[PDB]
Coordinates of C-alpha atoms and ligand atoms in Angstrom, one line a residue:
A1 CA 0.0 0.0 0.0
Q2 CA 1.0 3.6 -0.5
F3 CA 1.1 5.9 2.6
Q4 CA 0.9 9.7 2.5
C5 CA 1.7 11.4 5.7
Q6 CA 0.1 14.5 7.1
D7 CA 1.7 17.8 6.1
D8 CA 3.2 18.5 9.5
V9 CA 5.2 15.3 9.5
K10 CA 8.7 16.6 8.8
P11 CA 11.8 14.4 8.1
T12 CA 13.9 13.8 11.2
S13 CA 17.3 12.4 12.0
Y14 CA 18.0 10.7 15.3
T15 CA 21.2 9.7 17.0
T16 CA 21.5 5.9 17.4
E17 CA 20.5 6.3 21.0
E18 CA 17.6 8.5 20.2
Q19 CA 16.3 6.1 17.5
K20 CA 16.0 3.3 20.2
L21 CA 13.8 5.7 22.2
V22 CA 11.6 6.3 19.2
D23 CA 11.6 2.6 18.3
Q24 CA 10.2 1.5 21.7
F25 CA 7.5 4.2 21.4
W26 CA 6.7 2.9 17.9
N27 CA 6.6 -0.8 18.9
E28 CA 4.2 -0.2 21.8
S29 CA 2.0 2.0 19.4
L30 CA 1.8 -1.0 17.1
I31 CA 0.8 -3.3 19.9
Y32 CA -1.9 -0.7 20.9
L33 CA -3.2 -0.5 17.4
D34 CA -3.1 -4.3 16.8
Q35 CA -5.1 -4.7 20.1
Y36 CA -7.5 -2.0 18.9
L37 CA -8.1 -3.9 15.7
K38 CA -8.7 -7.2 17.6
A39 CA -11.1 -5.4 20.0
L40 CA -13.2 -4.2 17.0
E41 CA -13.1 -7.5 15.1
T42 CA -13.4 -10.2 17.8
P43 CA -17.0 -11.3 18.1
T44 CA -18.7 -10.6 21.5
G45 CA -22.3 -10.9 22.8
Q46 CA -24.7 -12.1 20.1
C47 CA -22.6 -10.6 17.3
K48 CA -21.0 -13.2 14.9
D49 CA -18.4 -11.2 13.0
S50 CA -17.3 -8.2 15.2
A51 CA -17.7 -6.8 18.7
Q52 CA -21.2 -5.9 20.1
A53 CA -21.4 -2.2 20.9
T54 CA -23.9 -0.1 22.8
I55 CA -25.2 2.5 20.5
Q56 CA -28.1 3.8 22.7
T57 CA -28.1 3.5 26.5
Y58 CA -31.9 4.1 26.4
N59 CA -34.0 3.3 23.3
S60 CA -37.2 5.3 23.8
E61 CA -39.4 2.6 22.1
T62 CA -38.0 -0.4 24.0
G63 CA -37.0 1.3 27.3
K64 CA -33.8 -0.8 27.1
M65 CA -30.2 -0.4 25.8
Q66 CA -29.7 -0.8 22.1
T67 CA -26.7 -2.4 20.5
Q68 CA -25.1 -3.0 17.1
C69 CA -22.3 -5.2 15.8
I70 CA -19.7 -2.5 15.4
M71 CA -18.2 -3.5 12.1
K72 CA -21.6 -3.0 10.4
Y73 CA -20.7 0.7 10.3
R74 CA -18.8 1.5 7.1
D75 CA -16.6 4.1 8.9
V76 CA -15.6 1.4 11.5
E77 CA -14.9 -1.0 8.6
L78 CA -12.5 1.6 7.1
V79 CA -10.7 2.2 10.4
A80 CA -10.1 -1.6 10.5
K81 CA -9.0 -1.6 6.9
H82 CA -6.4 1.2 7.6
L83 CA -5.2 -0.5 10.8
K84 CA -4.6 -3.7 8.9
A85 CA -2.6 -1.7 6.3
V86 CA -0.5 -0.1 9.1
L87 CA 0.2 -3.4 10.8
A88 CA 1.0 -5.2 7.5
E89 CA 3.6 -2.6 6.4
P90 CA 4.7 -0.9 9.6
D91 CA 8.0 0.3 8.1
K92 CA 6.0 2.4 5.6
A93 CA 3.5 3.6 8.3
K94 CA 6.5 4.6 10.5
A95 CA 7.4 7.3 7.9
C96 CA 4.3 9.1 9.3
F97 CA 5.3 8.5 13.0
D98 CA 6.9 11.2 15.2
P99 CA 7.3 11.5 19.0
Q100 CA 6.1 15.1 18.8
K101 CA 9.2 16.3 20.7
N102 CA 9.1 19.7 18.9
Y103 CA 5.4 19.8 18.0
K104 CA 4.3 23.4 17.3
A105 CA 0.5 23.1 16.7
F106 CA -0.3 23.4 20.5
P107 CA 1.1 22.3 23.9
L108 CA 1.3 18.6 24.8
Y109 CA 2.0 17.5 28.4
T110 CA 3.1 14.7 30.6
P111 CA 1.1 14.3 33.8
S112 CA 4.0 14.4 36.3
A113 CA 7.7 13.6 36.8
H114 CA 6.6 10.3 38.3
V115 CA 4.8 9.4 35.1
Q116 CA 7.7 10.8 33.0
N117 CA 10.1 8.5 34.8
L118 CA 8.2 5.4 33.6
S119 CA 10.3 5.5 30.3
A120 CA 13.5 6.8 29.0
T121 CA 11.5 7.9 25.9
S122 CA 9.3 10.2 28.0
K123 CA 12.2 11.7 29.9
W124 CA 13.9 12.5 26.5
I125 CA 10.8 14.0 25.0
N126 CA 10.6 16.2 28.1
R127 CA 7.1 17.5 27.8
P128 CA 5.9 20.2 30.2
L129 CA 4.3 18.7 33.3
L130 CA 0.7 19.1 34.2
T131 CA 1.6 19.3 37.9
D132 CA 3.4 22.5 37.0
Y133 CA 0.6 23.7 34.7
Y134 CA -2.1 23.3 37.4
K135 CA 0.0 24.7 40.3
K136 CA 0.3 27.8 38.2
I137 CA -3.5 27.8 37.4
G138 CA -4.4 27.3 41.1
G139 CA -7.9 27.7 42.5
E140 CA -10.5 24.9 42.2
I141 CA -9.5 23.9 38.7
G142 CA -5.9 23.6 39.8
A143 CA -6.9 21.6 42.8
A144 CA -8.6 19.0 40.7
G145 CA -5.8 18.9 38.1
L146 CA -3.3 18.3 40.8
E147 CA -5.4 15.6 42.3
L148 CA -5.7 13.8 39.0
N149 CA -2.1 14.3 37.8
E150 CA -0.4 13.6 41.2
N151 CA -2.2 10.3 41.2
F152 CA -2.2 9.6 37.5
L153 CA -0.5 6.2 37.6
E154 CA -2.8 4.8 40.3
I155 CA -5.9 6.1 38.5
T156 CA -4.8 4.7 35.1
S157 CA -3.6 1.4 36.6
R158 CA -6.9 0.3 38.1
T159 CA -7.9 -1.5 34.9
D160 CA -8.8 -5.0 33.9
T161 CA -7.9 -5.8 30.3
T162 CA -8.0 -9.6 30.6
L163 CA -11.5 -10.2 29.1
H164 CA -11.5 -8.2 25.8
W165 CA -7.8 -7.7 25.1
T166 CA -5.1 -10.3 24.7
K167 CA -2.3 -8.0 25.9
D168 CA -2.4 -5.4 28.6
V169 CA -3.0 -2.1 26.7
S170 CA -3.0 -0.1 30.0
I171 CA -0.2 2.0 31.3
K172 CA 1.1 -1.1 33.1
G173 CA 1.6 -3.1 29.9
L174 CA 2.6 -0.3 27.6
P175 CA 4.4 2.3 29.8
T176 CA 6.4 3.9 27.1
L177 CA 3.2 4.6 25.1
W178 CA 1.2 6.0 28.0
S179 CA 4.1 8.1 29.4
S180 CA 5.2 9.5 26.0
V181 CA 2.0 10.4 24.2
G182 CA 0.9 14.0 24.5
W183 CA -1.7 14.6 27.2
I184 CA -4.1 17.4 26.7
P185 CA -6.1 19.2 29.5
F186 CA -8.9 19.6 26.9
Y187 CA -11.4 21.4 29.2
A188 CA -9.1 23.3 31.6
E189 CA -9.5 26.6 29.8
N190 CA -13.0 26.2 28.5
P191 CA -15.5 28.2 30.6
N192 CA -18.4 26.4 29.0
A193 CA -17.2 22.9 30.1
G194 CA -19.0 22.6 33.4
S195 CA -17.6 22.2 36.9
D196 CA -14.1 23.2 38.0
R197 CA -13.4 19.7 39.1
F198 CA -14.4 18.2 35.8
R199 CA -12.3 20.8 33.9
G200 CA -9.2 20.1 35.9
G201 CA -9.8 16.4 36.2
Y202 CA -10.0 15.5 32.5
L203 CA -7.2 14.5 30.1
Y204 CA -7.0 12.8 26.7
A205 CA -4.2 11.8 24.4
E206 CA -4.0 10.7 20.8
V207 CA -1.7 7.9 19.6
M208 CA -2.9 7.9 15.9
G209 CA -4.7 10.7 14.0
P210 CA -4.3 14.1 12.5
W211 CA -2.8 15.3 15.8
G212 CA -1.3 12.1 17.1
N213 CA 2.2 10.5 17.0
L214 CA 1.2 8.4 13.9
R215 CA -0.2 11.0 11.4
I216 CA -1.2 9.3 8.1
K217 CA -3.2 11.5 5.7
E218 CA -4.1 8.8 3.1
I219 CA -3.6 5.1 2.4
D220 CA -4.0 4.2 -1.2
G221 CA -5.8 7.4 -1.8
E222 CA -8.3 6.9 1.0
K223 CA -8.4 9.6 3.7
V224 CA -7.6 8.0 7.0
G225 CA -10.4 8.9 9.4
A226 CA -9.1 6.8 12.4
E227 CA -8.2 8.9 15.5
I228 CA -7.2 6.6 18.3
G229 CA -6.0 7.3 21.9
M230 CA -7.1 7.3 25.5
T231 CA -9.0 9.4 28.1
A232 CA -8.9 9.8 31.8
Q233 CA -11.6 11.4 33.9
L234 CA -11.2 12.0 37.7
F235 CA -13.8 10.4 39.9
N236 CA -16.6 12.6 41.5
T237 CA -17.0 14.6 38.3
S238 CA -19.8 15.0 35.8
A239 CA -19.5 16.3 32.3
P240 CA -22.0 18.4 30.3
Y241 CA -23.9 16.7 27.5
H242 CA -21.7 16.5 24.4
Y243 CA -22.3 16.1 20.6
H244 CA -20.2 16.4 17.5
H245 CA -20.1 15.3 13.8
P246 CA -17.5 12.5 14.0
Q247 CA -18.6 9.1 15.1
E248 CA -16.8 8.0 18.3
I249 CA -15.9 4.8 20.1
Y250 CA -15.1 4.2 23.8
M251 CA -13.6 1.0 25.3
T252 CA -13.7 1.0 29.1
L253 CA -10.5 0.0 30.9
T254 CA -11.3 1.0 34.5
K255 CA -12.4 -1.8 36.8
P256 CA -15.1 -0.1 38.9
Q257 CA -15.2 -0.4 42.7
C258 CA -19.0 -0.3 42.7
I259 CA -21.3 -1.1 39.8
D260 CA -22.4 2.6 39.3
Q261 CA -18.9 4.2 39.7
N262 CA -18.7 5.1 36.0
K263 CA -22.0 5.8 34.1
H264 CA -22.3 6.9 30.5
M265 CA -25.2 8.0 28.3
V266 CA -25.5 7.9 24.5
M267 CA -28.8 8.6 22.8
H268 CA -29.3 9.5 19.1
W269 CA -30.1 13.1 18.5
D270 CA -33.6 12.3 17.3
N271 CA -34.4 10.0 20.3
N272 CA -38.0 10.6 21.4
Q273 CA -36.9 11.2 25.0
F274 CA -35.7 14.7 23.8
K275 CA -37.5 17.6 22.1
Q276 CA -36.2 18.5 18.7
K277 CA -37.0 21.6 16.7
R278 CA -35.6 22.3 13.2
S279 CA -33.1 25.2 13.1
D280 CA -31.3 26.7 10.1
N281 CA -29.5 23.7 8.7
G282 CA -29.6 21.9 12.0
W283 CA -31.6 20.9 15.1
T284 CA -32.3 22.5 18.5
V285 CA -32.3 19.6 20.9
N286 CA -33.8 20.3 24.4
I287 CA -32.9 17.8 27.1
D288 CA -34.9 17.6 30.3
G289 CA -33.5 14.9 32.6
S290 CA -34.7 16.8 35.7
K291 CA -36.5 15.2 38.6
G292 CA -34.7 11.9 38.2
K293 CA -35.6 11.5 34.5
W294 CA -31.9 11.3 33.6
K295 CA -31.3 8.1 35.5
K296 CA -32.8 5.7 33.0
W297 CA -30.6 7.3 30.3
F298 CA -27.4 6.3 32.0
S299 CA -25.8 2.9 32.0
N300 CA -23.0 1.5 34.1
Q301 CA -19.6 1.0 32.5
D302 CA -17.2 -1.8 33.1
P303 CA -14.4 -3.6 31.2
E304 CA -16.3 -6.9 30.9
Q305 CA -20.0 -6.5 30.1
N306 CA -20.7 -2.8 29.2
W307 CA -17.3 -2.2 27.9
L308 CA -17.9 -0.9 24.3
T309 CA -20.0 1.9 23.0
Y310 CA -20.2 3.6 19.5
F311 CA -21.7 7.1 19.0
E312 CA -23.4 7.8 15.7
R313 CA -23.0 11.3 14.3
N314 CA -24.3 14.0 16.6
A315 CA -25.4 11.5 19.2
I316 CA -25.8 13.1 22.6
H317 CA -23.5 11.7 25.2
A318 CA -22.1 12.2 28.7
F319 CA -19.9 10.5 31.3
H320 CA -21.0 10.7 34.9
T321 CA -19.0 9.8 38.0
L322 CA -21.0 11.3 40.9
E323 CA -23.0 8.3 42.0
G324 CA -22.5 5.6 44.6
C325 CA -18.9 4.9 45.7
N326 CA -17.6 8.0 44.0
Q327 CA -18.5 9.4 47.5
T328 CA -16.2 6.9 49.3
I329 CA -13.3 6.1 47.0
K330 CA -10.1 8.0 46.4
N331 CA -7.5 8.3 43.5
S332 CA -9.9 6.7 41.0
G333 CA -11.8 7.6 37.9
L334 CA -12.8 6.5 34.4
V335 CA -10.0 5.5 31.9
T336 CA -10.8 4.4 28.4
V337 CA -9.4 3.6 25.0
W338 CA -10.9 6.3 22.8
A339 CA -11.4 6.8 19.1
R340 CA -13.1 8.7 16.4
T341 CA -13.7 7.2 13.0
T342 CA -14.0 10.2 10.6
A343 CA -11.5 12.7 11.9
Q344 CA -10.9 14.2 8.4
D345 CA -14.4 15.2 7.3
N346 CA -17.1 17.6 8.6
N347 CA -16.7 19.7 11.7
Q348 CA -14.4 18.1 14.3
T349 CA -15.4 20.6 17.1
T350 CA -16.5 19.0 20.3
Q351 CA -19.8 20.7 21.0
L352 CA -21.2 21.3 24.5
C353 CA -24.8 21.6 25.4
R354 CA -25.5 24.7 27.5
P355 CA -27.8 25.1 30.5
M356 CA -31.3 26.2 29.7
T357 CA -31.1 28.6 32.7
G358 CA -28.1 30.5 31.3
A359 CA -24.3 30.7 31.9
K360 CA -24.8 31.3 35.6
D361 CA -25.3 27.5 36.1
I362 CA -22.4 26.2 34.0
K363 CA -20.3 25.3 37.1
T364 CA -22.9 22.9 38.4
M365 CA -24.0 21.2 35.1
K366 CA -25.0 17.6 35.6
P367 CA -27.4 15.1 33.8
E368 CA -30.4 16.4 35.7
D369 CA -30.0 20.0 34.5
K370 CA -32.2 21.0 31.6
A371 CA -29.9 21.7 28.6
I372 CA -30.0 23.0 25.0
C373 CA -27.9 21.5 22.2
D374 CA -27.5 23.4 18.9
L375 CA -26.7 20.6 16.4
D376 CA -25.5 21.3 12.9
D377 CA -26.3 19.2 9.8
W378 CA -23.3 17.2 8.5
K379 CA -22.4 16.7 4.8
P380 CA -23.6 13.4 3.3
Ligands
ZN1 ZN1 -17.6 12.8 22.2

């Protein structure tokens, strides 16, 4: 196959010792992506040819979760095709791989010196530390960011990968990968993103994609939509309802300490539980989960049974860690393998629903608060 890299992949020359640091990073990236392919393709549940994914946590007509065999989606099928191509000719794919040591698009971080010390590669890349970032920010956002990043290894180690993976894709099994990828405090500076603790207690990283370490633009003239990485959300946080054009996949790694520690919601934009009104080339979606109505929309997440979920375009979704033992545990959270399938078409912006009661209530947003989501049509 023919690989065309993204335009910001620049030729590089490493010393012999530096090349070994890159190579270990690359090798663990390939394990991660091979395990990702196997997680998509290995049959589970009542699916014969691929993994069974939750696509609605509450189907309005059945009052029950709704699933689909994940490789029935053509965009997922193409991710798998492109992963197979990468794994079949990794020397060619490696031309598009870079440790992002001098990446200019935006800042990338390592959680802490403790996490940095997990690999010679991470020490060499020498990303700025999130413990320094959040000490400077201070306040309640900084307090949450310190709590997450000071305890990052413990939070991301409380995982069980034995049932749906054949190798430990967590930070324990792939420490060079998890310590060297670029971590992004995606919500820390977003005043619309809800509570201060959620904003400081959220991180993601991208192994493969238009902003990852592996940045392939096209394979055999096909645009690579795959965008694959990981997320970490501190316990006792709730996110605002989210939506966006790209389809999205989460695989839950955290082993919960109570069945309701980590709850998620995904419901299609046109679900009859919401109120929709046509807007100019879009939809206004009003969400009223008040007075306990939200509870039936949210499902428990775990690495065995409810481990896989796939979000169709503009599906409303949220991750919620306030219930149950979130009020007794410590140094815990929700850690996942994360992906989007169409990162090179339509609007990649992560959209946030907003409180119906105005900006005054952003800092307490939670599933029970009435919200408005301004969805845009995507291109066919
Ligand atoms: Zn999302």
